[PDB]
Design a protein around this ligand. Structure first.
Ligand SMILES: O=C(O)Cc1cs/c(=N\C(=O)CCNS(=O)(=O)c2ccccc2)n1O
Ligand SMILES: O=C(O)Cc1cs/c(=N\C(=O)CCNS(=O)(=O)c2ccccc2)n1O
Ligand SMILES: [Zn+2]
Ligand SMILES: [Zn+2]
Lengths: 338, 338
């Protein structure tokens, strides 16, 4: 899996041990941990394969962040805070809830000030409760000046050269992630390039390449859980998702100062280590490089994923109702392509 | 089925008896036999439902045609003549044979002069052979003057008013069909409006509306047998085509002077009656009325058929190879829409 856990400097003991990792049915192989000076890492990023960069200093001024420093300087803005009854957080598109009334949310969002989220957090911890919170908020301009200069201290020289050397679109947003220990963002894929910059705590990252689409069974494109796996990693229904017995992931554990390149359309399962405290992450999202003019075959796996996405979308608009997409596709293939 | 067989004028006995009809597994109901003066027939054509018109006089000058008269006056042109080992004639798109090398033809076309087709026909009949021929040739300008004035004697006044009253495109071709008794054109659908004008002999016509697509399992759009049913009507494989046990057809027997409106996208199975002699038919093909601007829901069954056709076609061009259309569609629906 994540291999032997790393030893921290000053003989401060192992960063983590295997008992902080949850258990799953599939095998994993390690994502390489390299230096940004190492051309191997430059090659993996160009080939859109994940790599963990150990020395970008991307969010070096942010490494001092904790709950106290942030609450004092983050400002008086509103922060999206997602609550969950269990460790699996259930995210959904609230716009697409119009198409699936038979879908009930179990992880609702709540806007609140940063001091309210910290108050609500220690309230759960002193009460011994089991409710979980996950703060996910795009950084805007309403943030204090001390956090502003921390932001200015990011290694923009390195990441901008990466944005230009790959031909990516410009940075779209910076997402701040403050999660509780044991929190799980279940497997899903994103449509942009991601630099996963870990700040506080450790996160286990399990990635699946786009060519394992048929092993991970994403929800219908019109479903509020579009881009998420239907497979319950904790209780995989092998009768509904038989190819999940063939899935094989890429695994790593990122700590403070580590930066994980999650390529676009790559599945990822992110969990904050059990009994590891709160985790802090900042994501850098870039739109992928524009699709080239000369179409070259064979197609990349992610290009076929985009094709299936658009067939579903266009079929939903053509039939006038997304709920008829399913039966028409079965009509199209039953006894004709299977 | 076709109901009680009609009695011919002058007490010349029944036109046909049930023993000339082949046997099939599905039930049928009769296509109405009306007069073109009857507004009910005008309503069926407008609703794109089949009707048999008994008194159009559409091909009145052609009713005198037989093998001898045609051979003398049809001219010295080349006629497409399809040969078959069995009663089921196997038609295919020769352009699409590039995609399915694993497909071998069993009914080859042969160009020949009209006198050669008649010579080859009586050759089979005197030899007692079982090889079958089917002449199918679009009428052109290379045809003799006596046939030209027969053509001019067609009821263009009636059929042109029908072409205008429905908003159809112009006439695209006239197909002459001369078949042997027992010949079968297996079930398929056409993309144009058809006026089926019977001249000599009797043909049993079995039609299925477009909403029975999932009962009739057409070949993949890129297959040389695109638009034909994969179901062998003589030996239906219920394990591969289970919804064929739900199919229900519309049946009629057309004779000399009868005109059958086969609406666009309607399946049809056409067989020349057993022991009925040669059959002669002329088809009038019109492109359907252009799709209206304001898209109105619910969609017609044939509109959904066009949607599935175009998804298959566009997917074949996007992937660069029609043979990958199947696996991608299964990947798209397996565990996601079924
Ligand atoms: O818990 C963890 O640490 C993992 C985690 C927290 S949030 C997350 N993903 C998203 O929020 C979706 C991004 N989708 S996007 O199309 O690329 C996009 C859309 C809009 C702006 C910018 C980008 N992951 O994987
Ligand atoms: O044996 C019988 O009596 C039945 C019979 C003989 S041929 C036949 N069908 C076709 O040849 C296909 C027409 N397809 S089309 O798209 O509308 C079209 C294409 C090009 C020009 C004009 C029209 N049927 O059903
Ligand atoms: Zn993500
Ligand atoms: Zn036809």
């Amino acid at each position: 899996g994540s291999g032997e856990p790393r030893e921290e400097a000053g003989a401060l003991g192992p960063a983590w041990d295997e008992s902080q990792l949850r258990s799953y049915s599939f095998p994993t192989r390690p994502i390489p941990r390299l230096s940004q000076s190492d051309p191997r890492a430059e090659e993996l990023i160009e080939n859109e394969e994940p790599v963990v960069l150990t020395d970008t200093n991307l969010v070096y001024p942010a490494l001092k962040w904790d709950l106290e420093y942030l609450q004092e300087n983050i400002g008086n803005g509103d922060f999206s805070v997602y609550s969950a009854s269990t460790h699996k957080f259930l995210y959904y598109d609230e716009k697409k809830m119009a198409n699936f009334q038979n879908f009930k949310p179990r992880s609702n969002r709540e806007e609140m000030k940063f001091h309210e989220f910290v108050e609500k957090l220690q309230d759960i911890q002193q009460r011994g409760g089991e409710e979980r919170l996950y703060l996910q908020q795009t950084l805007n301009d309403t943030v204090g000046r001390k956090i502003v200069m921390d932001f200015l201290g990011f290694n923009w020289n390195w990441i901008n050269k990466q944005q230009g050397k790959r031909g990516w679109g410009q940075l779209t947003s910076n997402l701040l992630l403050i999660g509780m220990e044991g929190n799980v963002t279940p497997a899903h894929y994103d449509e942009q390039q991601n630099f996963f910059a870990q700040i506080k705590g450790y996160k286990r990252c399990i990635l699946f390449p786009p060519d394992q689409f048929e092993c991970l069974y994403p929800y219908p494109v019109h479903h509020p859980c579009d881009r998420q796996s239907q497979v319950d990693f904790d209780n995989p229904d092998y009768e509904r998702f038989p190819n999940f017995q063939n899935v094989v992931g890429y695994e790593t554990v990122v700590g403070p100062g580590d930066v994980l390149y999650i390529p676009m359309y790559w599945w990822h399962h992110i969990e904050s280590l059990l009994n590891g405290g709160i985790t802090i992450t900042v994501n850098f999202w870039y739109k992928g490089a524009p699709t080239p003019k000369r179409i070259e075959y064979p197609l990349k796996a992610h290009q076929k994923v985009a094709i299936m996405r658009n067939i579903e979308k266009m079929l939903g608009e053509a039939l006038g109702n997304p709920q008829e997409v399913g039966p028409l596709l079965n009509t199209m293939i039953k006894g004709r392509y299977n």
